[PDB]
Amino acid sequence: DERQGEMNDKGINVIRSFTDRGFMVWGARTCVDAANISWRYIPVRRLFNSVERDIRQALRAVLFETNSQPTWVRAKAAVDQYLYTLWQKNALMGARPEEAYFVQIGQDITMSEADIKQGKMIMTVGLAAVRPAEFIILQFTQDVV
Amino acid sequence: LKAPGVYIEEDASLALSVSNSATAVPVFIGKFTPTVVDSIQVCTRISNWLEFTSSFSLAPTVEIVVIETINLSPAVEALRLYFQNGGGACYIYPLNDAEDELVLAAIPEVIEQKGDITLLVCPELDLDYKTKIYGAVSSLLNDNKVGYFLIADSNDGESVSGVWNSAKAAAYYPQLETNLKFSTLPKNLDELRTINEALAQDIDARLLEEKQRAVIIPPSAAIAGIYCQTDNRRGVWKAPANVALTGIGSLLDKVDDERQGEMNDKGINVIRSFTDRGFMVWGARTCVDAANISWRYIPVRRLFNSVERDIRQALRAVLFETNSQPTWVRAKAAVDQYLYTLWQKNALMGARPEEAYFVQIGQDITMSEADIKQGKMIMTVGLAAVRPAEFIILQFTQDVV
Amino acid sequence: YTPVVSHRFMASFIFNRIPDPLDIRFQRISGLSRELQVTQYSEGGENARNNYLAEKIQHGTLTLERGVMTVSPLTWMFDRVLSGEKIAYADVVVMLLNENSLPLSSWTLSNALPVRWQTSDFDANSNAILVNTLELRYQDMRWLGVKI
Amino acid sequence: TTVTSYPGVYIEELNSLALSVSNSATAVPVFAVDEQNQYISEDNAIRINSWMDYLNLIGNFNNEDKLDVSVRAYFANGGGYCYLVKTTSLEKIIPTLDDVTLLVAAGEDIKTTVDVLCQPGKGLFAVFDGPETELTINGAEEAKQAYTATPFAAVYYPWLKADWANIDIPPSAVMAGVYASVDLSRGVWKAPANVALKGGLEPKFLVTDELQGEYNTGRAINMIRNFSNTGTTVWGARTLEDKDNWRYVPVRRLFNSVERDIKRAMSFAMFEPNNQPTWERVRAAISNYLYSLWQQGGLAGSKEEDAYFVQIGKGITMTQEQIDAGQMIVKVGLAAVRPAEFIILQFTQDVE
Amino acid sequence: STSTSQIAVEYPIPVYRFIVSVGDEKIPFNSVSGLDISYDTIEYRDGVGNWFKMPGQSQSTNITLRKGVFPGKTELFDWINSIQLNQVEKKDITISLTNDAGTELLMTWNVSNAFPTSLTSPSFDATSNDIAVQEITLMADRVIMQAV
Amino acid sequence: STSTSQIAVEYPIPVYRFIVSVGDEKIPFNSVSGLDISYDTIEYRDGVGNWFKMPGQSQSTNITLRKGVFPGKTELFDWINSIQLNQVEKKDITISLTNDAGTELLMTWNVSNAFPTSLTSPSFDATSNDIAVQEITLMADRVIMQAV
Amino acid sequence: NWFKMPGQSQSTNITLRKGVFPGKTELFDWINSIQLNQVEKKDITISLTN
Prior knowledge:
The structure is cut from a larger assembly and holds 2 copies of chain A, 1 copy of chain C, 1 copy of chain D and 3 copies of chain E.
Chain C: E1 9-14, E2 19-20, E3 28-29, E4 34-40, E5 52-59, E6 62-67, H1 73-81, E7 90-96, E8 105-119, E9 131-137, E10 142-145
Antiparallel strand pairs in C: 1-2, 1-7, 3-6, 4-5, 6-9, 7-8, 8-9, 8-10
Chain D: E1 29-33, E2 45-48, H1 51-58, H2 68-77, E3 82-86, H3 90-96, E4 102-104, H4 114-117, E5 126-129, E6 153-156, E7 160-162, H5 171-185, E8 201-203, H6 209-212, E9 224-227, E10 231-234, H7 249-262, H8 276-295, E11 309-311, E12 327-333
Chain E: H1 4-10, E1 18-22, E2 25-26, E3 31-33, E4 39-45, E5 51-58, E6 61-68, H2 77-80, E7 91-98, E8 105-120, E9 133-140, E10 143-147
Antiparallel strand pairs in E: 1-2, 1-7, 3-6, 4-5, 6-9, 7-8, 8-9, 8-10
């Protein structure tokens, strides 16, 4: 345990051997600078990899359609119908699904006239992931009453 | 830390329940010392025991007077017993001086600014500390303000006898003697550690001496949880009495029935000890003149505080709308739909709900043309509360047939 | 006052004034009977009322069965005396229990000689615990406590 | 008490502790304590849970003290936890104290206190002592009027003597043990007479029956006396008042044991909304107490409607002006048992 | 043209408005059922023919009173959890048909010494629109029926 | 006009949203039913007439929790297959009524030592539109009900 | 100590149902094949399909 306290903060996970359970993988951090607490875990980095990998798969039915207002309202609905299923399976923490995600796309919300005339479309996806519990602390007192 | 896994640690602290309730929110004015910010927040909103430990001291403010008579402040301990009997999210107003006129007179100016307080407590023993606060707090007991039931304490059987003798006050006589102990901390004893070597070893022995004795507290803090506990169970309209205090040891006084007959008519309630049931709060009167039989009880005063506190919350969707006939018929329906729920939960005595309340508002029923042209609206709410049964009389006869 | 229930009990053994606190789990205990033997003597012209003469007291026999468990100092005692090695005595303390696991009354059974020891039968056709119906004869019984 | 250093067994002797068993009952004797006693502080009531707890207080036992021989005879007979109150502050501490059902004059004169303390509203039943001199048939009018005529007191004349004591033992010591030993066995409603005295207690003065014929009428003085079959026993069950309502102590002690267990049975009704659903919750909390007292044989009669009655309601017992004053008037009636004092035996010689 | 004061003295009273008081508490239940007063019968017939019928032993009483669960309130479980070996804190139950608001009682049933058995936790299924409802089947004695 | 924070503290909670945790796993079931806390009663009557009632032995607990089959997941069978002669790997079951998404628990039932009996394979018939649903009837002890 | 162990395995009899067909007599010649003590015991495989 005392050698692991530097390696895990460094970003090196460790397979640690417990006898009654076996060779368990122990550690879910990533090789990142320890000040960056946003991407400080594996799944917070790996879910955001997997969301945008399946959003590009879902946005490919949008590309060479015409650039106007009914094209955005189909592209906004495609990521809204995708992120709602991730909210269903408890991938995003929250209680009501306007908190777990938001998609903002529009004429003046995210773009300009010279932006659309070039032919590109920008939307802002943002989603709140669940952070796991690394450390636990058991506080054994003795005065019950 | 620095590594994942379990971390066993011993000699832990004590934790309590949260027990949230936004209807009886007390404020604790006393000798507290902040530890984390020390600077600007004149009073802090805590929500449970953990936000207290994350912001305050868990240390009694030791106060020495030089042959020396000393004083230990139980404000930290008296707040532990508030979370043990009931719960809530009390504002804590630390006040160590109580002689600066520029700070003490601004207690009502900051306590009306937050708009959530219903109870006003003072957990201290000292008469010259406590009676200086009640004079400043007594501006909240006027008719210009709403809510603000001052639950007080008398150190002896005699009345507190101030200008706060209004119907919004209650006093609870016997000081409690809690079973918990301390864990300890005249012009900065570390200065006197250098000057007088003889007094330093003298005062350090007495701090260890008063560490072993169980602390006595006033009941102005323990009944502040009793006022919240019977508000989750039975609502405001039930009397906060005939309910056992928890976590206290013995009482300090052992007042009987014949001494109580003057204190209760005076308006001082009493925690009375029955062996088979425990330390029950015994008395639901208020510090009022005994001729005024209308507000002669706690819940008859405290429900009328709580109704108009939630009517102002319900009437705020009316104010800056236009002043005409369809504005009144929405404001009349808002208090009618509120008072009907109070009639549902047996807060108002009666059989059919035109008796338990009445709201009268109109053009010529309550107002004038010069009244509406100024831009104000007057309605007359009136409601009949339930009066509890203090005395019972058992008449044991012997001739059955 | 109010009666007590008969499914909290423990019985501890005393092997040569050395107590045996490993063997307090039993399925049932026989219940302790003692009887004053009586010789009826009918006489003379008195042929309308009996006349009973007392005799010696006949104590009962204590049976107690348990599920068969890992070998213990109780089992090593019965196996030692029922293999003909050593005829030794063992004192039994049978006590009722309260709700707070306090004893109500206790029966001390001095110098109890282990007489017999019988297991339940194996059978492939039914599912039940193997029990150890082991029965021992005591020679005195001294009731002690409240709520006999 | 020896200090303990090593884990093991200590063989230290302690001669003659005179040890008695701890007992649990519901009868709590306030013991009056003379002012010259040192191990008591006034305006304070110390509590004695068993005979070892009294013997922890005084240190060692001596048979000279009028209190020390008093509480030994109390714990030898009935036991139960008692309150030792000094006499000069007894008027302040007994209204303070809950769990007080009988006030014992240990060996002191309390006749001025009982007149102000014992009231119809309270729940006490004092007991005190007769004269310690011999009294005859001729002095039946003089010592009878030395006590007041309140129905809340009982007088036992013959002072006790024991082999373990030197001073005579006052009979209100043992009679608080007898009141607590009979209430556990036979209940409150049976008379505390006709019961034996344990602890080796013996009466000082022999009493004839023709002597007791004059001290049973009017302000009665109960007497204890020994018989040939059983030994010493209590032989009186009359209080001081001689009206038929409160003539026997089992009647007065039942009505005092009822009220202390009604007022804790329906103490939930305090500061409750005073309407009708509070009332039937009160008349039902009394009625299945009195029925449970009915089935144990505490009241006389044969049905449950000749035994007791609980009647409350607006207009039945309380007026409308009593509702908004905060008063619930309750009327409860009882019909207790009376004991058989006399048994006469008629001896015919000629059989039919 | 009957008035509302003749209806309150002639017309019968409906089941859907009642209050239950468990000990000193008031818990709002959904359905209370199963309280009754039963007796067994003893017959004796002899010879020439006399068919004597007497009622005998009073039969047991277990009532079954039902309540939906609430997010903070756990009241019926801490009564069925309070039982260690032999004793529960026995309470008394008063059931009473009321007015519309609970300002009057109309007929009252008192239950003497009630201790709980058989608390039934709710039946979860993802296809039902029910409220999570639990029941408690407390055995007692001496149900009496009191007017007003 | 009640708010959504008074509904969460006054209004009762519905059955159709719960999560089950078998040991350390989370398996989504369809219908969990049959958990309760039962006791038997002991009566004692004597002579002059005293009808003493005491609750006696705790009665057994077997709950019945039901799940549709899934094309890869075989979880309930490898628990009823894991039993050789005498022992199973006993697990503990926690049932808990939740929020809409499983971010809050509202009331929790804990089951102490659960081993399975009677796995029922689905009922095939070519005339029904059902989902292939299997059930498991595991016997256990000490169902407790925990708030929040 | 309330020890609970699972004991004996309980018997299994399944019930599988078929309409009759004009030439096919298959289930009867299995219930007819039994003389005194033995049948030709078979094995059944049930399987949810595509």
